[PDB]
């Protein structure tokens, strides 16, 4: 009672206990009840969390996700578990099995995508496997043999179909594809989404998380579900989405993640003697999306802007996505120093009221800030992990260390919360969130 | 490859991952394949290993075991999982559901018992729960309310039915009840077991562990299975076993564990205001079995002897069971110093060829020693844990620390082996043995 | 900023750095400025803290202390550093070199004693040395050869000269001898000390600790210095002190430490083949002082009382010394359970306002409690260490572990404070106190 | 006995204990007896090791070194301790106090230089200080105010006086200036050093390290001492050395360290608002020396070569200095991949007989390899630390982590050896070497 925190070994043990408890067999749910299916960028982080425990099972997680990849290369953001209820929109609402020519056979999936963090998970699996000896290296190398082509098709689909004009930024047709559902980034684009006759429905998410301050509103869900109707009406056809979708944004954070993932996968390709044409393409996309991210940036602070394709307007908001260029590099030296000063100062990690020195999803000084409300304020362990790993890859060893130290202190309550209140540290969202346990497992070493 | 060992956090994580992987829902198998059911003293150690992870689930493990308790108080040594094959002798061979008047309804179990380590697990659960706050203490205290009477009936059955002459030692009717199946302790008693017409059978254990040097022989299994026929013939009736069983031994290690468990449970009873008559009975049995253990001891070395009830002979062997009096106390000061010198010297932990400073199941200098063969030599993590915990309770803080340190070094390969070769450290028996993971989880803290 | 605490490795490093920094060469000061000499109790703890760093230097610390032993066996509580001032009363005020027939040659010392924790340090040195191999064992064994007789003379002087009536309690002639200078324990005895013509003096301690709330009062110092005058008047003659001293108390905490120390030293004597007559005397004294401690205890609560020899009155106070019997054993079962309830309850470790679950030097509910004032309330790491070590020796592994855990949490600020405010955790007294660093070093392992 | 290794907390404690024990007051000796003075490179590492213990004392170490800076900016490689003998060549042999116009007043020093690792120490001090709060930041900032000009003069002297032709490489006039005294790197240049009438001398180093296999030969010492005679003949005059010195080499490893140090110091200059002209000069030198290092490299393997200025010949050897470009960056992508293959392959860290996955000072497959002989083969913790820190700065987090992990495993014997035998792990050179303790302290965090 005097201190409810766990020791590092207790916390590592509890994190692994959680991850195995969320394992259905060949896929791990993103949470026990709120997200009782496989999500795409959660599955990448689950593979990272499993890599210290079982390289074999980490590989199985990515194999299961890639078995659900669409014919055109798209990795969908949900792979539904057989016979599992409690989540809306479920398979019947997406109707991809009926409508989508490119949907997989004998997997049920959603019809939209999510960020390409998967190459980062492959790198972590390979790094663990190389420390474990010959039969474990064999498992990881066989996975590359089996799935290199699928990973290439995934990156190629993003580069060719969501960057049709070769601008070096990824277009999204749903805010859910950003992974930051209700981020202030998307409010002005969502204001221009006007539902027609929306088939009636009842939410499931707020039966599980009943505190309305922690989840998006009914009005937001109506817009989320209407965008599904627009996609269904064109049978999820990539060629038709630009003509019909009421939501078309370039997501600069997704773009920077893609730049990093292309560079990571290219290095893997060189190391494991994959086809040279693939490696060349990966390095070309890495630089294209780095340049595309940098082109969005504020001339004074270096902050990255999203772009509303329909309104033809830069989207200026004060969220963690502004720090996209720190992930992929490319800023002039002087502007990157400015951007780091913004990150470390009183609008973000240096805000005086924060319990931990961590990055809030929205700046506490922004008028959009809401300290409990999903992506409008709370501190997300998954983002702490991504920033710390990317910062270490920039060579910023001490910055990465500080994020990991603060992230472990926050996570030491053992709640493995989805997100945390930035001022009080109260755990929010789902407890026992898989990618929060995965962050801890990767950090503790 | 240069060092295949895991860090403490990696090892804690892997141990917890294992324990959750062996969880069928409400019972944890003793191993994945070799022991694919609940065993009684493994279940106690599983509860100890779960206590740092989930006090609720640790309590469930003991509830499941106690739901299989026999009408007369006996906790049987196996609770079979529904529909699970691969282990022999299974429920059909025991026939307790058909034959045994005292067997439980709607659980399938074996018809023999195992050591009463369960009170130790209850103590560890209570100690964890008191560090975790009010609702967790409530869970552990509700378990006491629900199961105190069952635990008393278990201890009472041992004291009244397996110590009918109030000698302060527990009589066994099968070597499997000692937990040390093929220990040299039992060879001379087993030589006086002569099977009649033994119904034919085929072993399952050595389909999984195929190296014949690691498991008991066919001849030993024939005697193990014949004792079952003798029990079935009298329908497992406690009153008839002395008249018919070809194997009747007083087990001094089981007796010392019972002395400790009675003292532990009595202290729990005082702390949680259980009935005074129960606490009195528990302290009386604690002293009775302490005295019964001491009465067996060698006048020079203090080593404890088992007793063959049929032959009316002391059984003098050089195994770890000799150190029974160190667990429960009671030796005169000079003889306990002698016994510690035997433990620490070249016949046991001080043997010059041992890889780790740990207690071999049989002395390496004994003619009975076999370095691979189950209880005839190998080092068992479960015994390391029991000795270390009991030594700490004696006040021997440094001795307990040394066993824990050496036990963690041995376990750092992450195999969670059932037992280890004493000279090479090669993992033997089943890998991913639940009570080895539980030892590690309890130690690492 | 966000977390001013140190990691275990940083804290262990800083603790060792401190201890080496307070080393004058062959003696370690108790603190850098407040206590710029060798104190007897502190030197034993310093040796414990040095044992994980250098067995050789740990031995040197005890050799230096024992080289200052008086001719009659008394270990004096201060061994002054050559040429060092800044402490009062210094050697000119004691005048033991000119007056005390039993004072050592070529060392300046005080003329009173302090608790015999030294045997505990010898045990910790031996335990470390046995893990370090042959050459290091040889160092520790040579120390035993060289100093066993001096240790016997120390224990024999306490037993024969400070327990002249064989009551099994140690008589003190100065509250400084208790180690707890201004403890409420001694108030009613000090109330009967009426100074005569007291040679003038200026305090030095409160030039260093200037906050008057943290140190004894001027009136208290006048009594401390008056007792020195009474001892000087009879030339520190043991046979004359009972006739002249205005302060004569039996210290039950000192008595319990002596019981423990005799038992510890007797076990060392058996293990290292010291003379049987010495070992027998040590076991006799251990039992005599265990019994003397038990004789002081309240028959309901077990709380131990001091005794005012002049007033022939039990001293009933609410301080940590009440728990003396927990250190040495001997209480009836029911009485010890009651005393443990008192320790863990709302008058001591369970008090709801304490920052840490640690033992305050005076109960916060006592009218005598002062949260800043030396031994009248603050939490002392040296006592946390002594209780935790003695509790582990009793077999109370979890109680010992909780004290160590809370003590490390309190110490993680790296101040190595002499004592801490019980509610706020503010560091008080001298910073960089050697026995606080020593406790941390021994704990972290 | 069974495991002579220390735990992380024990090792950190012992490392700090060592560093304080080698402290003379305001300077730390490089080792207790072999190197009983302040060395320049070692003093930077000592400051790194002191930074987690005391930012104030870490600053003092660099202040003492910089107080011995020559008038022209040169930091000499030895600052002698007052009155200390036991080292040769001592100050009487150098005669810099009488001959060297640029030598400092009130400090005795050598007359040659050593690598500019000092900026790296300043960065580590600042990083620690920023985690410690206001008063500690003020200490580190006051040091920057006081010493920024001296650090600039040090870098400017290297850039202008040891790179007179603006080739981006540092010229050495003594192999002692490289830090790698008997490296195979310098053999062909030393072969052209023919001593004249050399004033007689007796070595002191091999009175302390008596094993001749671990130290340079007598013939090598004659060349080392002859070079001193040549420098003394021209009164250590910078402008005259090119005309007279028989040894003139461009040291690519020293050059790469200088590039890194300039970049590090430039970033500090920006963060702490130092003059823009200084920051610009630092970035210019960082690029100049990065380019000079790259110009030495094999166009297939990336391996860096030294250059013999007198012979006008690239020096092709198989030592750890070949990996200079990995420290500073600048290689084309394909060439750096080749150089990393060389580092990780069977000629260096991948050699199958190495006990640890660490960088030997000379390749074990080189005909020059000698496994015991100083820089001709052994593994040096100081280099492990420098490579791991520079690798982390490159963004190679896992490579840096593997070096730290293996370095800690090697160091866990607690010898703090100067270097280790690459196959057996035997500690060699001086024990209690300060920069080995410093590496351990920085690593353990």
CSV table of C-alpha atoms in Angstrom, one decimal, chain B residues 167-317:
chain,number,residue,atom,x,y,z
B,167,UNK,CA,4.1,-42.1,15.9
B,168,UNK,CA,4.5,-38.7,14.3
B,169,UNK,CA,5.3,-40.1,10.9
B,170,UNK,CA,3.2,-40.4,7.8
B,171,UNK,CA,2.7,-43.9,6.3
B,172,UNK,CA,2.7,-44.2,2.5
B,173,UNK,CA,1.1,-47.0,0.5
B,174,UNK,CA,2.8,-46.0,-2.8
B,175,UNK,CA,6.2,-44.5,-3.6
B,176,UNK,CA,4.3,-42.0,-5.8
B,177,UNK,CA,2.9,-40.4,-2.6
B,178,UNK,CA,6.5,-39.4,-1.6
B,179,UNK,CA,6.8,-37.3,-4.8
B,180,UNK,CA,10.2,-39.1,-5.3
B,181,UNK,CA,9.0,-42.0,-7.4
B,182,UNK,CA,12.2,-43.9,-8.0
B,183,UNK,CA,14.2,-42.7,-5.0
B,184,UNK,CA,16.8,-45.2,-3.7
B,185,UNK,CA,14.8,-44.6,-0.4
B,186,UNK,CA,12.2,-47.1,-1.6
B,187,UNK,CA,14.3,-49.8,-3.4
B,188,UNK,CA,14.3,-52.3,-0.5
B,189,UNK,CA,10.5,-51.9,0.1
B,190,UNK,CA,9.8,-52.3,-3.6
B,191,UNK,CA,11.9,-55.5,-3.7
B,192,UNK,CA,9.2,-57.0,-1.4
B,193,UNK,CA,6.4,-56.0,-3.9
B,194,UNK,CA,5.6,-59.1,-6.0
B,195,UNK,CA,2.9,-58.5,-8.7
B,196,UNK,CA,0.2,-61.1,-9.2
B,197,UNK,CA,-1.6,-61.1,-12.5
B,198,UNK,CA,-1.0,-57.5,-13.6
B,199,UNK,CA,-3.4,-56.3,-16.3
B,200,UNK,CA,-1.3,-55.5,-19.3
B,201,UNK,CA,-0.5,-51.9,-20.2
B,202,UNK,CA,1.8,-49.7,-22.2
B,203,UNK,CA,3.7,-46.8,-20.7
B,204,UNK,CA,3.0,-43.3,-22.0
B,205,UNK,CA,5.7,-41.4,-20.0
B,206,UNK,CA,8.6,-42.8,-22.1
B,207,UNK,CA,6.8,-42.0,-25.4
B,208,UNK,CA,7.4,-38.3,-24.4
B,209,UNK,CA,10.8,-38.7,-22.5
B,210,UNK,CA,12.3,-41.4,-24.8
B,211,UNK,CA,15.8,-41.4,-23.3
B,212,UNK,CA,15.6,-44.5,-21.0
B,213,UNK,CA,18.4,-43.1,-18.7
B,214,UNK,CA,16.0,-40.3,-17.5
B,215,UNK,CA,13.0,-42.2,-16.3
B,216,UNK,CA,12.2,-45.3,-14.1
B,217,UNK,CA,12.4,-48.8,-15.6
B,218,UNK,CA,9.7,-51.1,-16.8
B,219,UNK,CA,10.3,-53.3,-13.8
B,220,UNK,CA,9.7,-50.4,-11.5
B,221,UNK,CA,6.5,-49.4,-13.4
B,222,UNK,CA,5.2,-53.0,-13.0
B,223,UNK,CA,5.5,-52.6,-9.2
B,224,UNK,CA,3.9,-49.1,-9.4
B,225,UNK,CA,1.0,-50.4,-11.3
B,226,UNK,CA,0.6,-53.5,-9.2
B,227,UNK,CA,0.1,-51.4,-6.0
B,228,UNK,CA,-2.9,-49.8,-7.8
B,229,UNK,CA,-4.4,-53.3,-8.2
B,230,UNK,CA,-4.0,-53.9,-4.5
B,231,UNK,CA,-5.8,-50.6,-3.7
B,232,UNK,CA,-8.6,-51.3,-6.2
B,233,UNK,CA,-9.2,-54.7,-4.8
B,234,UNK,CA,-10.2,-53.1,-1.4
B,235,UNK,CA,-11.9,-50.2,-3.2
B,236,UNK,CA,-9.4,-47.7,-1.8
B,237,UNK,CA,-10.8,-48.3,1.8
B,238,UNK,CA,-8.5,-46.6,4.3
B,239,UNK,CA,-9.4,-49.2,7.0
B,240,UNK,CA,-8.3,-52.1,4.7
B,241,UNK,CA,-5.0,-50.8,3.3
B,242,UNK,CA,-2.8,-51.9,6.2
B,243,UNK,CA,-4.1,-55.5,5.8
B,244,UNK,CA,-3.5,-55.8,2.0
B,245,UNK,CA,-0.8,-53.3,0.8
B,246,UNK,CA,2.6,-54.8,-0.2
B,247,UNK,CA,4.3,-51.4,0.3
B,248,UNK,CA,3.9,-49.6,3.7
B,249,UNK,CA,6.6,-47.1,4.5
B,250,UNK,CA,6.9,-44.1,6.9
B,251,UNK,CA,8.3,-41.2,4.8
B,252,UNK,CA,10.3,-38.9,7.0
B,253,UNK,CA,10.5,-36.1,4.4
B,254,UNK,CA,6.8,-36.0,3.9
B,255,UNK,CA,6.5,-36.1,7.7
B,256,UNK,CA,8.8,-33.0,8.1
B,257,UNK,CA,6.9,-31.1,5.4
B,258,UNK,CA,3.7,-31.9,7.3
B,259,UNK,CA,5.3,-30.6,10.6
B,260,UNK,CA,6.2,-27.3,8.8
B,261,UNK,CA,2.8,-27.1,7.1
B,262,UNK,CA,0.9,-27.6,10.4
B,263,UNK,CA,3.0,-24.8,12.0
B,264,UNK,CA,2.4,-22.5,9.0
B,265,UNK,CA,-1.3,-23.2,8.9
B,266,UNK,CA,-1.6,-22.7,12.7
B,267,UNK,CA,0.1,-19.2,12.4
B,268,UNK,CA,-2.4,-18.4,9.6
B,269,UNK,CA,-5.2,-19.5,11.8
B,270,UNK,CA,-4.1,-17.2,14.6
B,271,UNK,CA,-3.6,-14.3,12.3
B,272,UNK,CA,-7.0,-14.7,10.7
B,273,UNK,CA,-9.0,-15.6,13.8
B,274,UNK,CA,-9.9,-19.2,12.8
B,275,UNK,CA,-11.3,-21.5,15.5
B,276,UNK,CA,-9.0,-21.9,18.5
B,277,UNK,CA,-9.6,-25.7,18.5
B,278,UNK,CA,-8.2,-25.9,15.0
B,279,UNK,CA,-5.1,-23.9,15.8
B,280,UNK,CA,-4.4,-26.0,18.9
B,281,UNK,CA,-4.7,-29.2,16.9
B,282,UNK,CA,-2.4,-27.8,14.2
B,283,UNK,CA,0.3,-26.9,16.8
B,284,UNK,CA,0.0,-30.4,18.4
B,285,UNK,CA,0.5,-32.1,15.0
B,286,UNK,CA,3.4,-29.7,14.3
B,287,UNK,CA,5.2,-30.9,17.4
B,288,UNK,CA,4.1,-34.5,17.0
B,289,UNK,CA,5.6,-34.8,13.5
B,290,UNK,CA,8.7,-32.8,14.5
B,291,UNK,CA,9.4,-35.3,17.2
B,292,UNK,CA,8.6,-38.2,14.9
B,293,UNK,CA,11.1,-37.0,12.4
B,294,UNK,CA,13.8,-36.5,15.1
B,295,UNK,CA,13.2,-40.0,16.4
B,296,UNK,CA,14.5,-41.4,13.1
B,297,UNK,CA,17.8,-39.6,13.1
B,298,UNK,CA,21.3,-40.9,13.0
B,299,UNK,CA,23.1,-40.4,16.4
B,300,UNK,CA,26.2,-39.1,14.7
B,301,UNK,CA,25.1,-37.1,11.6
B,302,UNK,CA,21.5,-36.3,12.4
B,303,UNK,CA,20.4,-37.8,9.1
B,304,UNK,CA,16.7,-38.8,9.0
B,305,UNK,CA,15.8,-42.4,8.1
B,306,UNK,CA,12.6,-43.7,6.5
B,307,UNK,CA,11.0,-46.7,8.1
B,308,UNK,CA,9.7,-49.9,6.4
B,309,UNK,CA,6.6,-50.8,8.3
B,310,UNK,CA,6.3,-54.3,6.8
B,311,UNK,CA,9.9,-55.2,7.3
B,312,UNK,CA,10.1,-53.3,10.6
B,313,UNK,CA,13.4,-51.8,9.6
B,314,UNK,CA,15.0,-48.4,9.3
B,315,UNK,CA,15.8,-47.5,5.7
B,316,UNK,CA,19.3,-46.0,5.4
B,317,UNK,CA,20.0,-44.3,2.1
